[PDB]
């Protein structure tokens, strides 16, 4: 019941905030009632196994925000003994060392995992993150996954295949160039796909047909360097026909120079040349 030093607590809101206080470790005496825990703006460095494990357990803790706390290492079992944990945010931490077992018929309770801007200053980083996502099949109930701003070069096919509860996937502000060797064909449950601010030049017929087949999907494609040549014709025709693209009026050509900033929806065959 008390409230740890350097924290603010509310029994009524079941909320604990230990924010911008330069904590170097997770407080040991958190009250058992906590449902929402904010540990942002600190200097944690490393989160060890069982960093939140207590007796009695924090059995009500459902939302945990560790954003912007200079974490460079998250070790195996860091989140163990948190049977109610639904939402975890590790964004804006330079995670050089994310254990493959950081998050792991007995799946993790996690539903939402927010991992934006986790890439440390320049062993594949994307590979390390994917391993942590897929270890033990622990992330079965995961419905929302955010992986913005990570310098990722590819859309990881294994994540789409092996997290089939996913409803929301954010890969905005990465460096994706192509979707050619990834299939969206069977992603029934996928409701949102954020691909804004990548390096995509064009979408090909295969991709377009796959997306068109999904019952719930909303795709975000703004601020990519689209190339308005003859290879763009299928995508322009699709864009005119589709309802799955959000804010489709904003999509513009980056190249060639004579088409720069032209709206894709307005383009006709005579504009799309090679
Ligand atoms: C985790 O805590 C952070 C830090 O307070 C929240 O960060 C804010 O996020 C909003 C929406 O993305 C931004 O517009 C703010 O400017 C952010 N502030 C900072 C300092 O980064 C973040 O929303 C929290 N997430 C959850 C799920 O609690
Ligand atoms: C936390 O650390 C930074 C860097 O030393 C400092 O500027 C800041 O004042 C500290 N925060 C608090 C609340 O004292
Ligand atoms: C986009 O990504 C780059 C690379 O991670 C980053 O430095 C920048 O802050 C990001 N933009 C936003 C809005 O976060
Ligand atoms: C969806 O299709 C991919 C191949 O494109 C396959 O690996 C994956 O298992 C499929 N998903 C399900 C739920 O069967
Ligand atoms: C319905 O709308 C909400 C808010 O726009 C969204 O989160 C959800 O993904 C949508 N659901 C489906 C099934 O499209």
UniProtKB/Swiss-Prot annotation:
Outcome (variant: residue 65 to Q): Impaired trafficking to the cell surface
Effect of mutating residue 144 to E: Impaired trafficking to the cell surface
PTM section of the record: Highly glycosylated.
Residue intervals of the LRRCT domain: 213-274
Glycosylation sites per record: 22, 65, 205
Keywords from the named record: Cell membrane, Disulfide bond, Glycoprotein, Leucine-rich repeat, Membrane, Phosphoprotein, Repeat, Signal, Transmembrane, Transmembrane helix
Disulfide bridge partners, by residue number: 3-9, 7-18, 228-253, 230-274
LRR repeat windows: 33-54, 57-80, 82-104, 107-134, 139-162, 163-185, 186-205
Cellular compartment(s): Cell membrane
Domain of life: Eukaryota
Tissue specificity note: Expressed by all types of trophoblasts as early as 9 weeks of development. Specific for trophoblastic cells except for amniotic epithelium. In adult tissues, the expression is limited to a few epithelial cell types but is found on a variety of carcinoma.
Topology term for the membrane: Single-pass type I membrane protein
Record-level GO cellular component terms: axon terminus; cell surface; dendrite; endoplasmic reticulum; plasma membrane
Ranges for domain LRRNT: 1-32
Example GO biological process: synaptic transmission, GABAergic
Note: Antigen 5T4 is overexpressed by a wide spectrum of cancers, including colorectal, ovarian and gastric, but with a limited normal tissue expression. Could be used for tumor immunotherapy. Reduction of TPBG levels by siRNA significantly enhanced the beta-catenin/TCF transcription-based reporter pBAR activation in response to Wnt stimulation.
Notes concerning its domains: The C-terminus of LRR N-terminal cap (LRRNT) and LRR 1 are essential for the inhibition of the Wnt signaling pathway.
Function in brief: May function as an inhibitor of Wnt/beta-catenin signaling by indirectly interacting with LRP6 and blocking Wnt3a-dependent LRP6 internalization.
Protein name in UniProt: Trophoblast glycoprotein
Encoding gene, per UniProt annotation: TPBG
Residues of the whole record sequence present: 60 to 344 of 420
């Amino acid at each position: 019941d008390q409230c740890p030093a350097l924290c603010e607590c509310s029994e009524a809101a079941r909320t604990v905030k230990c924010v911008n206080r330069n904590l170097t470790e997770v407080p040991t005496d958190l009250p058992a009632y906590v449902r929402n825990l904010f540990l942002t703006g600190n200097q944690l460095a490393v989160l060890p196994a069982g960093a939140f494990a207590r007796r009695p357990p924090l059995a009500e803790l459902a939302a945990l925000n560790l954003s912007g706390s200079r974490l460079d290492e998250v070790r195996a079992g860091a989140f163990e003994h948190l049977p109610s944990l639904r939402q975890l945010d590790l964004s804006h931490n330079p995670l050089a060392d994310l254990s493959p077992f950081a998050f792991s018929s007995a799946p993790s309770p996690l539903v939402e995992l927010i991992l934006n801007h986790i890439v440390p200053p320049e062993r594949s980083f994307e590979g390390m993150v994917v391993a942590a996502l897929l270890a033990g099949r622990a992330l079965q109930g995961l419905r929302r996954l955010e992986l913005a701003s990570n310098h990722f070069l590819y859309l990881p096919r294994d994540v789409l295949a092996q997290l089939p509860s996913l409803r929301h996937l954010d890969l905005s502000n990465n460096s994706l160039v192509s979707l050619t060797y990834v299939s969206f064909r069977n992603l029934t449950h996928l409701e949102s796909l954020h691909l804004e601010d990548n390096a995509l030049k064009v979408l090909h017929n295969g991709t377009l047909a796959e997306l068109q087949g999904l019952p719930h999907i909303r795709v975000f494609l703004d601020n990519n360097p689209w190339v308005c040549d003859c290879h763009m014709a299928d995508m322009v025709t699709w864009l005119k026909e589709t309802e799955v693209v959000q804010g489709k009026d904003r999509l513009t050509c980056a190249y060639p120079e004579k088409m720069r900033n032209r709206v894709l929806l307005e383009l006709n065959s005579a504009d799309l040349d090679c």
